Symmetry: D2
Subunit: 116 residues, 4 copies
């Protein structure tokens, strides 16, 4: 499972559950082609987005629907989404964990990359 996303809520001190995540891959014409998407689980994790074979080298964008999350809590959000844009697999397959920590007016993200 070479791409995993984990999302946490800094207001409530919890996983961010049922958060939509879209992944895009930059196409030859410089547009963002849909690649994979899903929603975080009760643990704030989203597994099963892709497979080693599907996950070719390229520039990927992970877009996390932070706005819907805050609106369902009735808290005013600043951002439309949180983004994570990176080149993947250009030296062969790697496993990427993208973590995001959400506040209404801030987010932080980090990547953990391992070589299988």
């Amino acid at each position: 499972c070479p791409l995993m996303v984990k999302v946490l809520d800094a207001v409530r001190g919890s996983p961010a559950i049922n958060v939509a995540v879209h992944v895009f891959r930059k196409a030859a014409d410089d547009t963002w082609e849909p690649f994979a998407s899903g929603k975080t689980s009760e643990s704030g994790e989203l597994h099963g987005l892709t497979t080693e074979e599907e996950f070719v080298e390229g520039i990927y964008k992970v877009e996390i629907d932070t706005k819907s999350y805050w609106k369902a809590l009735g808290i005013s959000p600043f951002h439309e989404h949180a983004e994570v844009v990176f080149t993947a697999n250009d030296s062969g397959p790697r496993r990427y964990t993208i973590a995001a920590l959400l506040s209404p007016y801030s987010y932080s993200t980090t990547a953990v990359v391992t070589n299988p």
Copy 2:
């Protein structure tokens, strides 16, 4: 000066100097129209991006060229760039400061929205 961007380096504990920043406004056709751009100063700040008359409500994207910053320092980066996507809403305060804290595999961003 309703929009300011500030960028900091968490590896060296310094302003992030000469970082390219591009701002886009979402057009009616859902494309991103160039809006403003510049390079951070010696203080890590980019002032004078826009004026009150130009900065209307809407969805804006700030792209910060973090990869070029790191690669010139001889430190391997993860991201292509950092993004900040938000709605500018005339309700509430009128000056937006977008801050970004950079690490090779992580970033944090916050918005500070104030009157004077």
Copy 3:
């Protein structure tokens, strides 16, 4: 396992392995009494610090030896350690996950708290 600590490295994009973590509990005389300690595993996680019975209500301080971590990489660190000070279990047992993200001149921390 009611107290877990996870530590990530924002420079290398990895778990922070073999990081020392000390936990203290504020004593009646306002000094910090040693409570539990350990080192993060290959996954950056430290489990097994305490048990429900040992982990009474009180004010706890988690001190993460960030300085040794950076010095073993030959990277100059700013902080002596990273701290996380909080009241625990004052409404009965809870499970606390303390996450920390380390850069040489910055750290971020968040807590996930669940009710067993």
Copy 4:
């Protein structure tokens, strides 16, 4: 003004105003000796903590009373306070800005060390 502290609120997207900040210097007996303190201004900043003549090399602790900030706003906080523990070293730049970004269950802190 060799030491400045800046505090931001990630829930409301604002400076964190009237936040108590205490600075301590580690004494020879390993106790923390009061060194400087104050409250953040309307801009979230605390200037004038010390002078060049007073701020000698050594280990310093900055304690930021985050709990009092949140509890007065009617938002439940996790931490008792935030801490920043660091060595002041006269090698390298001479002005230290300690920034803290607050959320109820999280904080981020960075140091920016500059000359003018």
